[PDB]
Design a protein around this ligand. Structure first.
Ligand SMILES: [Ca+2]
Ligand SMILES: [Ca+2]
Ligand SMILES: [Ca+2]
Ligand SMILES: [Ca+2]
Ligand code: NA
Length: 483
């Protein structure tokens, strides 16, 4: 069967402590619509109860120790999460855990440290003389004590920070110490983009490397994870991420599928990451997200023949995870760049019914976003589900592309003899509607095909040669399959 990933959270999921129970209760539904793997949000204790998990405090607290005034994380307790994972697994759905390793937040106390300021546009340049600051670098885990791991963190396990408690000023501070320097290789944006926020972990320190590997193995075994999603990958030493993945694979004996979030709209820099990690993990196709967004915002003016230009999926199809929107690009967020609603079904048709890439459905698109703007994403589950059924049951076999018009483009799938009644013909348009003659295979000659989306009510008959004339409404999508 075709695999399909689901990101199971949005930025505004409520802080009610019931997200793991929600996942548990949705397992049958997700397995029925064709989801084969779920990516869950960071499951460890953040700097406060309401943090989404991207300001992690203790990676070994999955919601069972009293720290930061709460036992549970925003999402629920550890046993609720283990029950949700058991429910997905008994329905043959895999679970990928979010991995947040670039920084630590919420230290228990400050320490005195010698530091220098660096230029924010070129972090290789020191712009001050050294002086003393008070940084939030002492991590002692008072509610956990030594359970699972007796490692304690100090200033010398980090490369820098962004706050001095002494003078109350925010700058990019590089710490002075034995062999201290920003890590390499990382993105060369801003000269060296090792530093992002909070306390930056030093992946040049050998005890840090060894402890983080040990934690990885622990995490995968404690939750029976099947894979990982790597946060902020362009800010972490590449050869460490390559080796960390390999050590978890070695120790568990599992495939451990892994996809890294390398956020940059540039195929060439994404290819460099693949090469530097030996092709041992996939990346999200950031350039394809931007092309889909562009088409959605030009009111019919985009040249649809160019949708695949500059994307990772056209170059390295087996190492790309395709997506429409996520918690970074939804309304009101940092990297806001939402695909407009009218084009969203066309974009899901594009990523779910084509043969290359591993596609991700976003929770925020299925169920709606609960942010406070006036342009939240509405619940589109009734428009997306017919497209998921087309992926599950009909998108198999040889593909033929028709990227030959500036508005109306399409593709077909001939079907596979081992998947009964498989085969489809898809058309999308960013402008007025119309028709296109396309080939679906001579083995489907004489059949009645119909639009599974319901956008068009008239069926189409495949001629004796295996060709059919398919239609599509203005600014819409049609997917024809065997009636
Ligand atoms: Ca370093
Ligand atoms: Ca870093
Ligand atoms: Ca157009
Ligand atoms: Ca057929
Ligand atoms: Na670092």
């Amino acid at each position: 069967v075709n695999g399909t990933l689901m990101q199971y959270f949005e930025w505004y999921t409520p802080n009610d402590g019931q997200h793991w129970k929600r996942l548990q209760n949705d397992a049958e539904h997700l397995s029925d619509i064709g989801i084969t793997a779920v990516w869950i949000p960071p499951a460890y204790k953040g700097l406060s109860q309401s943090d989404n998990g991207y300001g992690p405090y203790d990676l070994y607290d999955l919601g069972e120790f009293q720290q930061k005034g709460t036992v549970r994380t925003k999402y629920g307790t550890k046993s609720e999460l283990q029950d949700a994972i058991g429910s997905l697994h008994s329905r043959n759905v895999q679970v990928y855990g979010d991995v947040v390793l670039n920084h630590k937040a919420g230290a228990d106390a400050t320490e005195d440290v010698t530091a220098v300021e660096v230029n924010p546009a070129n972090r290789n340049q020191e712009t001050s003389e050294e002086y003393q600051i008070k940084a939030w670098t002492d991590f002692r885990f008072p509610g956990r004590g030594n359970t699972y791991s007796d490692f304690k963190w100090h200033w010398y396990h980090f490369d820098g920070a962004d706050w001095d408690e002494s003078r109350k000023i925010s700058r990019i501070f590089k710490f002075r110490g034995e062999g201290k320097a920003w890590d390499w290789e990382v993105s060369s944006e801003n000269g060296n983009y090792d530093y992002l926020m909070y306390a930056d972990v030093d992946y040049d320190h050998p005890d840090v490397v060894a402890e983080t590997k040990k934690w990885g193995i622990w995490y995968a075994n404690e939750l029976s994870l099947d894979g990982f999603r790597i946060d902020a990958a362009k800010h972490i030493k590449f050869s460490f991420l390559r080796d960390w993945v390999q050590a978890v694979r070695q120790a568990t004996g599992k495939e451990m599928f892994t996809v890294a979030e390398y956020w940059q709209n540039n195929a060439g820099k994404l290819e460099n990451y693949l090469n530097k990690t030996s092709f041992n993990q996939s990346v999200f196709d950031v350039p394809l997200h931007f092309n889909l967004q562009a088409a959605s915002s030009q009111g019919g003016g985009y040249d649809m023949r160019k949708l695949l230009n500059g994307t990772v999926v056209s170059k390295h199809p087996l190492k790309s995870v395709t997506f429409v929107d996520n918690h970074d690009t939804q309304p009101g967020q940092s990297l806001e760049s939402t695909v407009q609603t009218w084009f969203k079904p066309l974009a899901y048709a594009f990523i779910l019914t084509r043969e290359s890439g591993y596609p991700q459905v976003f929770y925020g698109d299925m169920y709606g976003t609960k942010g406070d703007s006036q342009r939240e994403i509405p619940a589109l589950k009734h428009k997306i589900e017919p497209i998921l059924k087309a992926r599950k049951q009909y998108a198999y076999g040889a593909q033929h592309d028709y990227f030959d018009h500036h508005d109306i483009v399409g593709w077909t799938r001939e079907g596979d003899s081992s998947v009964a009644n498989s085969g489809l013909a898809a058309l999308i348009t960013d402008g007025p509607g119309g028709a296109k003659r396309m080939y679906v295979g001579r083995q489907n000659a004489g059949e009645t095909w119909h639009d599974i989306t319901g956008n068009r009510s008239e069926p189409v008959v495949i001629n004796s040669e295996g060709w059919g004339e398919f239609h599509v409404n203005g600014g819409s999508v049609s997917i024809y399959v065997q009636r």
